[PDB]
């Protein structure tokens, strides 16, 4: 189990129960305890320990919580240099659609993310 610390405004990825994912500067929230599992090497799954939903990304690139894992719940996982990670939506690895949060907490649409951005670096912390 592990908080997912986005380096941007310092939030913690939070998959909510209505499927809305966004970020929170609140550690205490239990909807932010995600656990990562790996479907293969370099490929990871991310799911709420609280609700069991899965992280996932539309075709619009909208991070969203899915009740059951699928083609959209899989994410590439690179261990950047700052020591920070980076999850590339697999289904949209071709267009570098990263999982990211903006400074205001909202998520970032896959398409507007871009390597080198600061909203795309998460630092997994223990739960």
UniProtKB/Swiss-Prot annotation:
Name its cellular compartments: Secreted; Cytoplasm; Cytoplasm, Cell cortex; Cytoplasm, Cytosol
Q: Name one GO molecular function term.
A: fibroblast growth factor receptor binding
Q: How is it modified after translation?
A: In the nucleus, phosphorylated by PKC/PRKCD.
Q: Write out the GO cellular component annotations.
A: cell cortex; cytoplasm; cytosol; extracellular matrix; extracellular region; extracellular space; nucleoplasm; nucleus
Which controlled-vocabulary keywords does the entry list?
Answer: Acetylation, Angiogenesis, Cytoplasm, Developmental protein, Differentiation, Growth factor, Heparin-binding, Mitogen, Nucleus, Phosphoprotein, Secreted
Establish whether keyword GTP-binding is in the entry: no
**Residues binding heparin, per UniProt:** 1-3, 88-91
Principal localisation: secreted
A single BP term in Gene Ontology: positive regulation of epithelial cell proliferation
Q: So what family is this one in?
A: Belongs to the heparin-binding growth factors family.
Outline what the protein does: Plays an important role in the regulation of cell survival, cell division, angiogenesis, cell differentiation and cell migration. Functions as a potent mitogen in vitro. Acts as a ligand for FGFR1 and integrins. Binds to FGFR1 in the presence of heparin leading to FGFR1 dimerization and activation via sequential autophosphorylation on tyrosine residues which act as docking sites for interacting proteins, leading to the activation of several signaling cascades. Binds to integrin ITGAV:ITGB3.
Assembly and interactions? Monomer. Homodimer. Interacts with FGFR1, FGFR2, FGFR3 and FGFR4. Affinity between fibroblast growth factors (FGFs) and their receptors is increased by heparan sulfate glycosaminoglycans that function as coreceptors. Found in a complex with FGFBP1, FGF1 and FGF2. Interacts with FGFBP1. Part of a Cu(2+)-dependent multiprotein aggregate containing FGF1, S100A13 and SYT1. Interacts with S100A13. Interacts with FGFBP1. Interacts with LRRC59. Interacts with CSNKA, CSNKB and FIBP. While binding with LRRC59, CSNKA and FIBP seem mutually exclusive, CSNKB and FIBP may cooperatively interact with FGF1.
Protein known as? Fibroblast growth factor 1
State start and end of the fragment within the whole protein. 26 to 152 of 155
